[PDB]
Amino acid sequence: SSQIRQNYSTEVEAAVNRLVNLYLRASYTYLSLGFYFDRDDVALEGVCHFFRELAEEKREGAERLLKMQNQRGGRALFQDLQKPSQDEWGTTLDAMKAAIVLEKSLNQALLDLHALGSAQADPHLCDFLESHFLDEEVKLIKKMGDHLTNIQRLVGSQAGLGEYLFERLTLKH
Amino acid sequence: SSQIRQNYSTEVEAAVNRLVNLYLRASYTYLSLGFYFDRDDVALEGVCHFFRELAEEKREGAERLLKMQNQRGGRALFQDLQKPSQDEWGTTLDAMKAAIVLEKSLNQALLDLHALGSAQADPHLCDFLESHFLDEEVKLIKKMGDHLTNIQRLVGSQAGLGEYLFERLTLKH
Amino acid sequence: SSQIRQNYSTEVEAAVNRLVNLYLRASYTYLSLGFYFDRDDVALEGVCHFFRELAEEKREGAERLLKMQNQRGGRALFQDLQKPSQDEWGTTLDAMKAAIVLEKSLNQALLDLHALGSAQADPHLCDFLESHFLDEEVKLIKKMGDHLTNIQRLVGSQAGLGEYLFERLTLKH
Amino acid sequence: SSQIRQNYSTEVEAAVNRLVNLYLRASYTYLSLGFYFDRDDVALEGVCHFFRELAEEKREGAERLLKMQNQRGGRALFQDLQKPSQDEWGTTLDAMKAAIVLEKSLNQALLDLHALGSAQADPHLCDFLESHFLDEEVKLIKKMGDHLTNIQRLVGSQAGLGEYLFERLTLKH
Ligand SMILES: [Cl-]
Ligand SMILES: [Cl-]
Ligand SMILES: [Cl-]
Ligand SMILES: [Cl-]
Numbered sequence: 235s236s237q238i239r240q241n242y243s244t245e246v247e248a249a250v251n252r253l254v255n256l257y258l259r260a261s262y263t264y265l266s267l268g269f270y271f272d273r274d275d276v277a278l279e280g281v282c283h284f285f286r287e288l289a290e291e292k293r294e295g296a297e298r299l300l301k302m303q304n305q306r307g308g309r310a311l312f313q314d315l316q317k318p319s320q321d322e323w324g325t326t327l328d329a330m331k332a333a334i335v336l337e338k339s340l341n342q343a344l345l346d347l348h349a350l351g352s353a354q355a356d357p358h359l360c361d362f363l364e365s366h367f368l369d370e371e372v373k374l375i376k377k378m379g380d381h382l383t384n385i386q387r388l389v390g391s392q393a394g395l396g397e398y399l400f401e402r403l404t405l406k407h
Numbered sequence: 408s409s410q411i412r413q414n415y416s417t418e419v420e421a422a423v424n425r426l427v428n429l430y431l432r433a434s435y436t437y438l439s440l441g442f443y444f445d446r447d448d449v450a451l452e453g454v455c456h457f458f459r460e461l462a463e464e465k466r467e468g469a470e471r472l473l474k475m476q477n478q479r480g481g482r483a484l485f486q487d488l489q490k491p492s493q494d495e496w497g498t499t500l501d502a503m504k505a506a507i508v509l510e511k512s513l514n515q516a517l518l519d520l521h522a523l524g525s526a527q528a529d530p531h532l533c534d535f536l537e538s539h540f541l542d543e544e545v546k547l548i549k550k551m552g553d554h555l556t557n558i559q560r561l562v563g564s565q566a567g568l569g570e571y572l573f574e575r576l577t578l579k580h
Numbered sequence: 581s582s583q584i585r586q587n588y589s590t591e592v593e594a595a596v597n598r599l600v601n602l603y604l605r606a607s608y609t610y611l612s613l614g615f616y617f618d619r620d621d622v623a624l625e626g627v628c629h630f631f632r633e634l635a636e637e638k639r640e641g642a643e644r645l646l647k648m649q650n651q652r653g654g655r656a657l658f659q660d661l662q663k664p665s666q667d668e669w670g671t672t673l674d675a676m677k678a679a680i681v682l683e684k685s686l687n688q689a690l691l692d693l694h695a696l697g698s699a700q701a702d703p704h705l706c707d708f709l710e711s712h713f714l715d716e717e718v719k720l721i722k723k724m725g726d727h728l729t730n731i732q733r734l735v736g737s738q739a740g741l742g743e744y745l746f747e748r749l750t751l752k753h
Numbered sequence: 754s755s756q757i758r759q760n761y762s763t764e765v766e767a768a769v770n771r772l773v774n775l776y777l778r779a780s781y782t783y784l785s786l787g788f789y790f791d792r793d794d795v796a797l798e799g800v801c802h803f804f805r806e807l808a809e810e811k812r813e814g815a816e817r818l819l820k821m822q823n824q825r826g827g828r829a830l831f832q833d834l835q836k837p838s839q840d841e842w843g844t845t846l847d848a849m850k851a852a853i854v855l856e857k858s859l860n861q862a863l864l865d866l867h868a869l870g871s872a873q874a875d876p877h878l879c880d881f882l883e884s885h886f887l888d889e890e891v892k893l894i895k896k897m898g899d900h901l902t903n904i905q906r907l908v909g910s911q912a913g914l915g916e917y918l919f920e921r922l923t924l925k926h
Binding site for chain 2: 615
Binding site for chain 4: 583584586652
């Protein structure tokens, strides 16, 4: 059972498990995005690398949540992981827009869990999200927004040219 | 506009811009204090160095606020910067007293913004102030209070002697 | 008072204080330009870096003037710092044009102060501007003019593309 | 005779020789000041070191003038060197006051020679004074003024104590 659990509500425990699912879902989404941009008929290596990096980051966030769950004496519970929302992700612009939507959904789940922790007077939970999640998410969304802006300015008259140039001169390859 | 902004109130945005003004004001105050102690008819190099260091620190705090403003998708807005409150700053004691007053005003602005962020349920803002501002300010005010105490004990019967000795043996030169 | 002042007119003293204000103003302008290009909906990092570097350079020029003021036995006097002329700076081209205008105004203030120093037979002042300001300003204006030319040749038919390419391939990022 | 002399007036040549005399005079003054503070009944080593350093600097300035005289094709002419104005130099304060008076006299001779060079349209002479003399002199006078201020604040009620402390904690020993 638990010899250690203290000030750790069932509501937070359950919300943490749900959040783990959301992060692993997001990881799966990024895995799919990365392999889509690796297709020979898409072939945007920097875009592939960007999303594959994110798949790892999201899996790592899930692992951190699970470690914390055990540190507090809650019980990790896993649920089915739904497949990503698309099988093909369109253009780099389409993909970066979908990524921002995803990140905003993760961010809102972080904020909701912070609020629950505040309401439950669980400062460890609140601190944990503050120290390892909230700023990481703000920085990532800023990066994506910066990317989106640059992608959009490159569409101009020649979408292919702009998409190639963004991948070559902004993304790491 | 903003593709990224999330959970970032107009009230916090505005308060952040005001705080930037207060930090740049404080930087300007320290610049003036530093050059006053550099005057040939004042000539207290360690006191000059102390305040010039602070001018840099305050400018850096303003820059951090502005970076954060952009990370959250708010709009930096600059206003006129008023000149420091004095053209001549008296003795080291006078100056350190004015510095403490200034720091307490900055500290109270930090606390007020934290409270606003708490009321707006903006944990990123709250965390940001906690991680980069609140303790830095507490440590600085403790240092100033320590300095003030030492300056006051040196006034004794011979103010000039005490003012020279404090600058030589406490402040870095 | 001053035990050191020699051959240092009140007119030069006053003009030096005014020039300090103009440099700190210019620094503030560059600060605003830098954070504008950091906006997620602008997102031109090399342009942000270019102007943030300039903000530092202009603050440094003000500090050098103030140091000199004290070396000659004049009295630094600070005035209010007006806010930059715009809250949003348009395109890179708009910004570089505004920067050149600013630099030409600083250059003319340098030249006017040199002429005053010559008329007052103050060779130290004249030398000081020659050694630390005049050539620095000529080199900067040449750089800006070079930049302007390249930005203008890239507008062509596709302004977004050209603006991205200039930032990627000319400016440091 | 001179195969090289060009644009080098007899008036400047003569003024350069006079200036050499003034620098060697100043060197002699500093030599005397240094050995006075080395007396067993004065015994202020940092004050001795300060003035002995200056004796060397002034001799070096004379040597630079003489080198320049030959570079321009003028004729070095030496005159008698008068002895310093005092045989005993009083207190550190007395000495630093006498040093400032001396430096202001050297500075005025520099300025007068610059003005002569300007009137004779001799830009090499003007440049030479600007590059090697005028700022060196301004910096030295600022240093002396800073010293004077600190010495004066230490007189207070206990002149001996203050004189010892200045020598120990400001001057290099
Ligand atoms: Cl199941
Ligand atoms: Cl205004
Ligand atoms: Cl005012
Ligand atoms: Cl003779």
